[PDB]
Amino acid sequence: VSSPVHSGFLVSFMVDARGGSMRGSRHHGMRIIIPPRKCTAPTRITCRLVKRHKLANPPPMVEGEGLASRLVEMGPAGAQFLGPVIVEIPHFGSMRGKERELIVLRSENGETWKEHQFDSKNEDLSELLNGMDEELDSPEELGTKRICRIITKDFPQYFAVVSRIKQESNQILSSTTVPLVQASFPEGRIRVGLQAQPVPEETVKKIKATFSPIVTVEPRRRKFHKPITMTIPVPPPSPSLRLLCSITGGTSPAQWEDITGTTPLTFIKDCVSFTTNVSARFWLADCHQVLETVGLASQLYRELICVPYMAKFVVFAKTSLRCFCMTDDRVDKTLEQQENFEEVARSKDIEVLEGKPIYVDCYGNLAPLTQQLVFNFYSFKENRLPFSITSQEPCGRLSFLKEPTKGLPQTAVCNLNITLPAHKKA
């Protein structure tokens, strides 16, 4: 005779046993589903994204990791549900097609962080014939929609969505991203994982030397009982081959040194097999000038650690032009709607790099008075670009590219066609 509820919430809402499918009206895509007969008392559930202040000791991300979404505050600090409940949070972290993964971190109190594991998943039973139902179409549908689903029997204080290079792990290992990567440790007890990083030729050329996939074992700086055999692909040639290694632990930034002397570099069919008693980052660098490698590697490593973010480009205008690159930022920005701008150009989501500047070019329309102009993309920040701006059509097309050049053409990241309003002369 009674039915579960379904409504939109900014940050908090009340839910009883009857049920609750709640869409976050603030942050689109943020959904929490409480099945029926799941929570026992009437309870105030809060799902908040932290921006007012910086939390003490935020989640411990190693080098190259980065937060997919912001940090989420749960309402009841240690709420317990008999059945499982669903918390869906939109992120803006680009996965580069199975190259990257998402680890789910939780803080119980706010001091320490650990990983959230869920026992199993059975969508029909967990829903418990919920009227709203509509668990998003498929895991692939989640991937295309950039929605992170967390299934849980109890809320912690803080949840964290983290983007990292995918790690292959078990309780004789090999990468599921690059095939010819293998670590041979005699079997027989704890869990360890291995991550293999891809390297692109174009990005390498931007900053003489060739490089292999960065092979990494997640529990770094650990001495195994016996040495472990490592098999790594051979970078193409440009003794020229060299092996780089980094033992910096945890969050600490990596330090690279050349270990060619301490490493018997056996060869097995376009590979390098060798032994090591210590767990650390390993890299092959093939270039004839031996002394240069480490420094040049550092120039690449700093570039590689940068994390990708599916950003949208937006162009406002007023008779003058504002260019935003945004991820979860409030669309129809309040400053513009106040200052009488208009949303002349939107974009599809295109992968861009945080901390890396993106250059703006205009083709077929007016140019700024100005010395070219640029801005960087900082994730979860509002990146604002102001603009000081024949007689047939006002149409113009502007492009956004990571590289500055006119010597050769560089493929663009975004390409927005735009059209002015011509209300009054400016």
């Binding site: 009674s2 919430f9 900014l10 940050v11 908090s12 809402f13 009340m14 009883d16 046993a17 009857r18 007969r37 799941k38 929570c39 026992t40 008392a41 009437p42 105030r44 921006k51 007012r52 008999l82 409030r330 309040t334 400053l335 106040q338 200052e339 509002e382 604002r384």
Partner: protein
């Protein structure tokens, strides 16, 4: 006059440079320099008149003089213009900082009231939750009134700065979003606290009502043994039958409450509600047996 150019250049250096207390003094100093610039204006007007020296028609440096006096005029007029340009920029900083204090004051206020509504104090007994609910409802009424006065005031104040054309009004608007977000977070928190109280009061009423009905049902059962036939028959039909009809309506009404509440809870809390409701029903039925024999009912109902 030759030194005056250097003297003006010194002011030119001071005027070009980059909390509320710093800005308020900043502008305090700058106002004095503008008054000092007016003093130079008195020097420039006479100096220009003296430099002219047209009647004498002397020509030793007349071409040079006509340029030095003109440069002095350009030097002073540009300097005065620069004094005004900074004055506006400094005033913007003071106005910007002055408003920021209020936004933070309002933001602190919401943190305070948020704490009040954060308080998830369920209540010791029914007599308590009634005070909680009838107090909190007044606190929400007041907050909702005065809070909106201030947020409207700060938005009016912030709208004036951005509408005024502030050189810093990108973080003014960022602040506006931040405040209005947090305000609409408090109202929303307030509401879910109001709801949570209503739910507690509804359960507390059921538990308190259960004690009273169970007491009344069994208490009226004790009166039955005490309980000629013409007098008793009239006494039962006239008063006793109406008494139970009233008592039964209360039991059924209590039963309705049990069910309404039963939707919203589950598990141990639901079980205890069923235990008390079953407790009332068992006592109620127990009275119905003992009472059945000596009972007069009208044909109609």
């Amino acid at each position: 006059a030759a030194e005056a150019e250097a003297w003006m250049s010194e002011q030119e250096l001071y005027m070009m440079s980059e909390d509320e207390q710093s800005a308020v003094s900043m502008l305090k100093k700058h106002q004095i320099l503008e008054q000092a610039v007016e003093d130079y204006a008195e020097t420039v007007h006479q100096l220009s008149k003296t430099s002219r020296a047209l009647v004498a028609d002397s020509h030793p440096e007349s071409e040079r003089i006509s340029m030095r006096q003109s440069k002095v005029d350009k030097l002073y007029a540009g300097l005065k213009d620069l004094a005004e340009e900074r004055r506006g920029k400094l005033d913007e900083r003071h106005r910007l900082f002055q408003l920021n204090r209020e936004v933070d004051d309002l933001e602190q206020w919401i943190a305070e009231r948020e704490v009040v509504a954060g308080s998830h104090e369920l209540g010791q007994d029914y007599e308590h939750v009634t005070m909680l609910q009838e107090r909190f409802r007044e606190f929400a009424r007041d907050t909702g009134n005065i809070g909106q006065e201030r947020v409207d005031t700060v938005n009016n104040m912030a709208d004036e700065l951005i509408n005024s054309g502030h050189s810093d009004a990108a973080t003014i608007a960022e602040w506006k979003d931040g405040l209005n977000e947090a305000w609409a977070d408090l109202l929303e928190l307030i509401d879910t606290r109001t709801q949570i109280l209503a739910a507690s009061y509804e359960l507390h009423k059921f538990y308190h009502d259960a004690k009273e009905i169970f007491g009344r049902i069994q208490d009226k059962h004790k009166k039955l043994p005490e309980e000629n036939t013409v007098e008793t028959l009239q006494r039962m039909h006239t008063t006793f039958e109406h008494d139970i009809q009233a008592l039964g309506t209360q039991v059924r009404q209590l039963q309705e409450d049990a069910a309404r509440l039963q939707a919203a809870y589950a598990g141990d809390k639901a079980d205890d509600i069923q235990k008390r409701e079953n407790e009332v029903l068992e006592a109620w039925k127990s009275l119905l047996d003992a009472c059945e024999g000596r009972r007069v009912r009208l044909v109609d109902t």
